[PDB]
Amino acid sequence: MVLSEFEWQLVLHVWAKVEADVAGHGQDILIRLFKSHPETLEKFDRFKHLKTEAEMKASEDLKKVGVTALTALGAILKKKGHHEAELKPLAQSHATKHKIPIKYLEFISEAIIHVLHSRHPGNFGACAQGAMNKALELFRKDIAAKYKELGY
Numbered sequence: 179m180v181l182s183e184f185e186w187q188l189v190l191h192v193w194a195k196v197e198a199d200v201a202g203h204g205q206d207i208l209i210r211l212f213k214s215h216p217e218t219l220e221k222f223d224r225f226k227h228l229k230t231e232a233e234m235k236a237s238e239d240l241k242k243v244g245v246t247a248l249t250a251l252g253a254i255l256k257k258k259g260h261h262e263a264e265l266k267p268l269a270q271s272h273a274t275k276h277k278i279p280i281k282y283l284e285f286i287s288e289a290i291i292h293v294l295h296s297r298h299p300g301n302f303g304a305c306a307q308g309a310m311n312k313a314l315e316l317f318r319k320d321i322a323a324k325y326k327e328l329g330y
């Protein structure tokens with residue numbers, strides 16, 4: 179699949195808004211992921227003992243991990259699909275080191291959309307949501323291709 183230039187424009191304008199508060203978006207995304215899908219927290223050896231939303235909000239480690247993920251995602255999105263070099267190492271680490279199934283990447287994609295809608299009323303309508311859904315789908319499909327090459 180491919181996104182149109184117009185779809186990329188929508189994605190990257192949204193992402194530039196995310197960049198005004200990367201840490202806050204990252205915290206909200208991971209907390210939404212862990213509350214909606216608690217099994218995902220087990221994959222985080224650095225902070226899998228966290229239990230409550232208040233503990234998660236007080237964790238500097240959770241915040242830093244969220245910032246790193248959003249930073250990498252932003253760098254990849256800015257390649258507008260031409261992201262082979264940037265995405266390959268990430269796909270490899272998630273297959274082999276972190277052991278993240280595709281279903282968990284679907285869960286985090288849902289969390290991203292949810293948080294974008296929650297944090298950006300009036301600036302995240304149907305056009306932007308559809309474009310971001312497609313960009314995240316492309317990201318997941320390209321990761322899945324690398325997973326298949328590894329037999330994961």
Ligand code: HEM
Pocket residue numbers: 218219221222223224243246247248250251267268271272276278282283286
């Ligand atoms: C938008 C999707 C995601 C992006 C862009 C992303 C990006 C990253 C990056 C850049 C790193 C550090 C470098 C590396 O190890 O490759 C990382 C680490 C990690 N990721 Fe992801 N990730 C994503 C989704 C996920 C999901 C859904 C999970 C688990 C359910 C996960 C689990 C981990 C873990 C456990 C680490 C190590 C964290 C730590 O150091 O404590 N990632 N991720």
